[PDB]
Design a protein around this ligand. Structure first.
Ligand code: HEM
Length: 94
């Protein structure tokens, strides 16, 4: 069973490698480590950015629709409500 594990942007900008690719697509801590062994196309691309900001590039490829909704299924803990309360309106678009 489980609990929300609200982690800050900073914390998530630590980890990267080693079966732990968490991302801030659209202001939420998304675990891609599961998808590292599932996601269509490849996992290397997932891991490249990892704990950074793999949003713009992801949307550039056209991750809207289905994948965008599925993004929400990788919710393991979300952002810290602190950061998240001040989440500046990012950008754009696709
Ligand atoms: C957690 C969010 C993610 C979800 C739910 C997701 C889901 C998907 C899905 C369903 C496809 C196929 C789309 C289609 O067939 O129309 C796809 C393809 C792809 N994804 Fe993701 N993805 C995610 C994150 C990422 C990230 C972070 C990257 C790297 C920036 C990435 C790079 C790619 C690439 C390169 C493809 C292959 C494009 C092709 O089929 O030629 N994805 N993704």
């Amino acid at each position: 069973d489980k609990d929300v594990k609200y982690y800050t942007l900073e914390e998530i900008q630590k980890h990267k490698d080693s079966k732990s690719t968490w991302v801030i697509l659209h202001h939420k801590v998304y675990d891609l480590t599961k998808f590292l062994e599932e996601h269509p196309g490849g996992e290397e691309v997932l891991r490249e950015q990892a704990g950074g900001d793999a949003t713009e590039n992801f949307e550039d490829v056209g991750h809207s629709t289905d994948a965008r909704e599925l993004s929400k299924t990788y919710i393991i803990g979300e952002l810290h409500p602190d950061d998240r309360s001040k989440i500046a309106k990012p950008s754009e678009t696709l």
